[PDB]
Design a protein around this ligand. Structure first.
Ligand SMILES: [Zn+2]
Length: 472
C-alpha cells in the first residue's frame, strides 16, 4: 500500500514526528520588526552570491502567517515543530539591547504551537550569526564566541524555557566549518585563495572547536541555572551522510571509516568520549586544537540527545596514507569519493547535485552511531529531498519521488530502530519550500508547496502521505 506498512504503530510508543524550518529560510521580515542583519543578509544581498540574486528578505513570510502554518502542520498530524530563533531578531547587535518586538514574535509562535498541541523543538542557531558579531569579534574564529553565545542562550532559556523543553544549540557546525572556512562558498567566504582572507587548513578546525566549546558553555549554564526549575533538555544538530567502502579491501574500509571520523566523529567523539577522533589527532596534528582536561570534561556528556541531519550516502575508495603538505580540512581525509559500484550509481540524484537518493544510508548512519557511541539518544532532525525550479504548481504537488523518498528512508530508519537503535524522533526537512541558501528559491524541499509570487501554501502529495501515516 502507499504507506508501505508504515504508521505510528510501526514506531516506538511516544516516538515524535515533526517538520523543520529555520529562521532565515522561512520567516522573512529580515530588516523589519527590529531585526538586525545576519551574515547571511549581507552575503545574500551581494550580487552573484545566491541563485538569481535572491535573498531571505521576505522568504515564505512565516512571520505574518505563522498561525496558518501551525494550523497546517496540526492538520497533517505532526506532534512537533523544529524551528530556530534568529539571534539578530532578539539582539540586533548580537549583544546588549533586546529587541522586544522580536521576543514577542517567538512568544506568540511558541504559545500558538502549545495551544495547538505541537511541541516546540527550538534551535538557537542556524547559520545566522549577527553581522555585528562577525565584524566586531571575527565570528567563530574567536574563542569569545563561547561567552557571547552563552549570554544569548541564557536570555532564551530565561525568556522561553518555562514553555520550551527541547532545545538545540547549533545546526550542522561541520557545514559552517566546511563551506564558510574551507571552500569559502558560504559566509564569511574564507579560504586559502579567498578575497576575504583565510586558511582552509587551519580555520575549519578553529571554528569547529569554538562551536564545541560554545555548545558546552551554553549547556553548563542551562544545567547550573535553569534546569532545576525548567526540567528541559538541550542537544545539538550534526549532519551525517553515510560512507560505504567501495570494496572489502583493507584500504577501502579504512577510507570509509576515515570519512566517518572526519565527518561525524569530529563532533561526536568530543561530545560522547571527550576527545577528537584518533585519526584526526594523527593526521591533522598541530592544526587540531587541544581541549584542556577541564574543557574536555565540560564538552563530554554535554548533549542530552544528538540531532542527526541525514540525507545521502557516498562510496569511498582508499589509498596508502601519505605524508602531505596540509592544504585543507577536505584534503586531510585522504579519501576518494565514488558514486557508482559494479557499474551502477549509488542512487539517482534529487535536484541538489550532492543529494543522492540512498535510503540504506539512513540505516547505515543510525546503526553506526548505535554501535560506535554506546547507543546515545538520537533524533533525526532533518531528512528530505528537493524538486527543481520552474515546475508548474500541479507538478510540485504531484511529488511522487518525495513520497517514495520518505517511505523508503522511514522503512530503513524503522529497520535500525527495530534492531535496537535509540532513536526518539524524526523530523522532515522541510514543512515548506523555502530559501535554500546558495540555491535561493531554485530548490524546493517542502512537503508543502509555496507559490513565491502569491505566498500561498498548497500541501503536496507527500504532506497527505504524512497525514495518512501519522493519524492518531
Ligand atoms: Zn507579511
Amino acid at each position: 500500500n502507499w504507506l508501505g506498512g508504515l504508521s505510528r504503530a510501526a514506531f516506538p510508543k511516544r516516538f515524535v514526528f515533526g517538520t523543520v524550518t529555520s529562521a532565515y529560510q522561512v520567516e522573512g521580515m529580515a530588516a523589519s520588526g527590529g531585526r538586525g542583519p545576519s551574515i547571511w543578509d549581507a552575503f545574500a544581498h551581494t550580487p552573484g552570491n545566491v541563485a538569481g540574486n535572491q535573498n531571505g528578505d521576505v522568504a515564505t513570510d512565516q512571520y505574518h502567517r505563522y498561525k496558518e502554518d501551525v494550523n497546517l502542520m496540526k492538520s497533517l498530524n505532526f506532534d512537533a515543530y523544529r524551528f530556530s530563533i534568529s539571534w539578530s531578531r532578539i539582539f540586533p547587535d548580537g549583544e546588549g539591547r533586546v529587541n522586544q518586538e522580536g521576543v514577542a514574535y517567538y512568544n506568540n509562535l511558541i504559545n500558538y504551537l502549545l495551544q495547538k498541541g505541537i511541541t516546540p523543538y527550538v534551535n538557537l542557531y542556524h547559520y545566522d550569526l549577527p553581522l555585528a558579531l562577525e565584524k566586531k569579534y571575527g565570528g567563530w574564529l574567536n574563542a569569545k564566541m563561547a561567552d557571547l553565545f552563552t549570554e544569548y542562550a541564557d536570555f532564551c532559556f530565561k525568556t522561553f524555557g518555562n514553555r520550551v523543553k527541547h532545545w538545540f544549540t547549533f545546526n550542522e557546525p561541520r557545514i559552517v566549518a566546511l563551506l564558510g572556512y574551507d571552500q569559502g562558498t558560504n559566509p564569511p567566504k574564507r579560504c586559502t585563495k579567498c578575497a576575504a582572507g583565510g586558511n582552509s587548513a587551519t580555520e575549519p578546525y578553529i571554528v569547529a572547536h569554538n562551536f564545541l566549546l560554545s555548545h558546552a558553555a551554553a549547556v553548563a549554564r542551562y544545567r547550573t541555572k535553569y534546569q532545576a526549575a525548567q526540567q528541559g533538555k538541550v542537544g545539538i544538530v550534526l549532519d551525517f551522510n553515510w560512507y560505504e567502502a567501495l570494496s572489502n579491501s583493507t584500504e577501502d574500509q579504512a577510507a570509509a571509516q576515515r570519512a566517518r571520523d572526519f565527518h561525524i566523529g569530529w563532533y561526536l567523539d568530543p561530545l560522547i568520549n571527550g576527545h577528537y577522533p584518533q585519526i584526526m589527532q594523527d593526521l591533522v596534528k598541530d592544526r587540531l586544537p587541544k581541549f584542556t582536561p577541564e574543557q574536555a570534561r565540560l564538552v563530554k556528556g554535554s548533549a542530552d540527545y544528538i540531532g542527526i541531519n541525514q540525507y545521502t550516502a557516498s562510496y569511498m575508495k582508499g589509498q596508502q596514507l601519505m605524508q602531505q603538505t596540509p592544504t585543507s580540512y577536505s584534503a586531510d581525509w585522504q579519501v576518494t569519493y565514488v558514486f557508482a559500484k559494479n557499474g551502477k550509481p549509488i542512487g539517482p540524484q534529487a535536484n541538489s547535485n550532492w543529494l543522492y537518493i540512498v535510503p540504506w544510508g539512513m540505516y547505515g548512519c543510525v546503526n553506526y552511531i548505535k554501535q560506535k557511541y554506546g547507543n546515545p539518544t538520537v533524533v533525526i532532525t532533518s531528512n528530505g529531498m528537493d524538486q527543481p525550479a520552474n515546475l508548474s504548481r500541479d507538478q510540485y504537488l504531484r511529488d511522487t519521488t518525495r513520497v517514495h523518498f520518505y517511505r523508503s528512508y522511514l522503512t530503513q530508519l524503522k529497520k535500525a530502530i527495530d534492531e535496537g537503535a535509540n532513536v526518539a524522533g524524526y523530523f522532515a526537512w522541510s514543512l515548506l519550500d523555502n530559501f535554500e541558501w546558495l540555491s535561493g528559491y531554485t530548490s524546493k524541499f517542502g512537503i508543502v508547496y509555496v507559490d513565491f509570487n502569491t505566498l500561498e501554501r498548497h500541501p503536496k502529495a507527500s504532506a497527505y502521505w504524512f497525514r495518512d501515516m501519522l493519524k492518531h
